[PDB]
Amino acid sequence: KEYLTKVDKLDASESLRKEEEQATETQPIVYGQPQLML
Amino acid sequence: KEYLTKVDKLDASESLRKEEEQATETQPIVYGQPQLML
Amino acid sequence: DIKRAVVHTHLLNPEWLVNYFGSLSVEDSLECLRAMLSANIRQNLQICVQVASKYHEQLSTQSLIELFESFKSFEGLFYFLGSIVNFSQDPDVHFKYIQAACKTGQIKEVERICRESNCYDPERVKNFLKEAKLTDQLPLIIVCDRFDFVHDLVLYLYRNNLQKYIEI
């Protein structure tokens, strides 16, 4: 049962990894700085 | 036994995630840039 | 689809852009601001706040600020509401300003409006202050004395920790 709780914590970690993947997908929006053309 | 070792590694990863959460909570200190008030 | 200035903003002068967005805005500036926020890069982030504080005097709709706060809004909302606390009597505006000041640390500017403004409910304010621990919070020892609620503040301090708060 404690191992299943650890599996639930691993699922929460996978949700955090999905949030990190969303952040990575949004990264090219911030990378497009118009000030880099100077 | 190897799975318990992997659970200990996952707990270390959760400690690293807690450190990242502390870094995120400290990020508002850097966010307070005085040049953004211009 | 005439809303295409999101890409031309990096080259056009912001003065005449704000002047064009202020006028001829028959329920049209909202869609332009939504399109600007859909591609809110760090470079064109402050311009979304500059244009935002021109039409609020005519129609301060809550939908705009609700769509704005949907993003990260590190200090854009705080910089916007910095000029809205004055000449206003709404408690929710002050509460959202306190939330924005708690998003990024600018708490030194909140202890003044708590003494100046007197048109808000201090209960929710002190609840939000006790919720978001600043770890260096001392506007509470000011607002509690302003509204005469130190009988529970002393208890809360003795509960959490008592080092310099009561002394200072």
Resolution (A): 6.3
Assigned token pair, C148: 């005469």
CA distance C108 to chain B (A): 12
Largest interatomic CA distance in chain B: 59
Give dist(CA C97, CA C101) in Å, integer.
6
Assigned token pair, B15: 């400690």
Instruction: Compute the count of residue pairs across chains A and C with CB atoms less than 8 Å apart.
Output: 13
State how far Cα A32 lies from the chain centre: 19
CA dihedral C55, C10, C45, C70 (to 10 degrees): 80
Query: What are the residues whose beta carbons fall under 8 Å from the beta carbon of C33, sequence distance 6 or more?
Result: C48, C51, C52, C64, C67
Give, in order, the Cα–Cα distances in Å from C163 to each of A36, B25, C108: 49, 23, 20
B2-11 long-range CB contacts below 8 Å, 24 or more apart? B3/A3, B7/A3, B7/A6, B10/A6, B10/A9, B10/A10, B10/A13
Mutate to test the interface with B, among C45, C73, C99, C106 (most CBs of B within 10 A): C106
Give dist(CA C55, CA C137) in Å, integer.
35
Mutate to test the interface with B, among A1, A2, A5, A6 (most CBs of B within 10 A): A6
